[PDB]
Design a protein around this ligand. Structure first.
Ligand SMILES: [Fe+3]
Length: 199
């Protein structure tokens, strides 16, 4: 129960209700279950009814909707393809929990591997961030197929450094090396209006 850090949205958010737990579609990689537990910063009690969005690139660093890897611009970015793999939304339960069935993310050049997330509560964009991986685990996974077929360090990454990525690393249960299980506990502020959206 300390306020989780926020991190810039980047350019590839797509504001669509795709409410599902399994976001893999046709993508290939290593299965990762991402469980996020949300509490209200103020009370430390779980937050119920919050919409959690995640989005991430596939193993070779492609984002669905931006598969033609277009030029990035400060002005509002619009997806060209209709694919939505590796994107989803889940609504927190009584316990403040959502779980997604995803893959370990690939990454871009000039970025460390991560999964984005954005949370709506009370019709406000309450919190935007990024999920990072412990260096040892990331190294293990990147040595396996298909991740090893195409890496900026956490500490080289502008976003990780500037926005406290250290407090935003997902905890992977090591014995889960059938499918990986990851837990990240977050404390957010449902009254906060984030200003970290791309537009
Ligand atoms: Fe990204």
């Amino acid at each position: 129960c300390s306020l989780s850090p926020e991190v810039g949205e980047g350019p590839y958010f797509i504001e669509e209700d795709i409410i599902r737990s399994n976001i893999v579609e046709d993508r290939i990689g290593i299965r990762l279950n991402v469980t996020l537990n949300l509490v209200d910063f103020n009370t430390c009690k779980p937050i119920k009814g919050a919409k959690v969005y995640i989005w991430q690139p596939d193993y070779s660093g492609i984002y669905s909707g931006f598969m033609d890897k277009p030029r990035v611009k400060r002005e509002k970015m619009y997806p060209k393809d209709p694919r939505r793999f590796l994107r989803g939304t889940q609504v927190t339960n009584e316990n403040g929990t959502v779980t997604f069935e995803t893959l370990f993310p690939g990454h871009y050049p000039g970025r460390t591997p991560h999964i984005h997330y954005r949370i709506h509560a009370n019709g406000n964009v309450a919190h935007i961030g990024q999920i990072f991986f412990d260096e040892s685990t990331s190294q293990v996974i990147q040595s396996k197929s298909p991740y090893n077929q195409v890496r900026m360090k956490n500490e080289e990454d502008g976003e990780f450094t500037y926005f406290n990525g250290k407090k935003s690393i997902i905890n992977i249960d090591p014995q889960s090396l059938d499918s990986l299980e990851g837990i990240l506990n977050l404390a957010i502020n449902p009254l906060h209006r984030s200003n970290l959206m791309w537009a």
